């Protein structure tokens, strides 16, 4: 897998996960998040491209979306989504 899914942990955990994939020879990874985690997804990418790999990574694409979540009871909520694909240069 080339995906880093952002959860509840500190941002640096995800930065490390990203750096680890890249260091293993994966040249493109995708940082994915939903809801409040979107801020941390953007932040993960920014830490990677400013502090750790400045001038060695670029953003290939940003996917901004929304989902309708339907549970077993039939009730719904809406949740924002982001996915950021980054690649070595």
């Amino acid at each position: 897998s080339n995906v880093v899914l952002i959860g509840k942990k500190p941002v640096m955990n995800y930065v490390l996960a990203a750096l680890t994939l890249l260091n293993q020879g994966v040249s493109e990874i995708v940082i994915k998040a939903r809801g409040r985690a979107i801020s941390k997804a953007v932040d993960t990418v920014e830490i990677v491209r400013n502090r750790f790999l400045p001038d060695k990574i670029e953003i290939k694409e940003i996917r901004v979306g929304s989902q309708v979540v339907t549970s077993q009871d039939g009730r719904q909520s809406r949740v924002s989504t982001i996915e950021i694909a980054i690649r070595k240069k």
Partner: protein
């Protein structure tokens, strides 16, 4: 010229959406939503709520993420460029 709305902690998502409708109704036909730090998700939420209210009347024409440095701290941002259609 180009109107930027900063998405702030001090107003909820729905009220920011409605602020953008006001701008549109006064002939602004493009706005850039900006969020920084934890308000990045809030800015995306505003965009999505607007998109739900307007449908094909609004389009996300560009998105950019990046960093600023304020008081020696690097802080992430998102910019969402919305265009009113019709």
């Amino acid at each position: 010229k180009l109107n930027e709305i900063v998405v702030r902690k001090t107003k909820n998502v729905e009220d920011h959406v409605l602020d953008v409708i006001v701008l549109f109704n006064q002939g602004i036909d493009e706005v850039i939503l900006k969020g920084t730090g934890r308000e990045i998700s809030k800015a995306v939420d505003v965009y999505n709520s607007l998109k739900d209210r307007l449908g094909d009347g609004v389009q996300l024409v560009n998105v950019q993420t990046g960093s600023e440095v304020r008081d020696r701290r690097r802080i992430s941002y998102i910019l969402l460029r919305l265009k009113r259609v019709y």
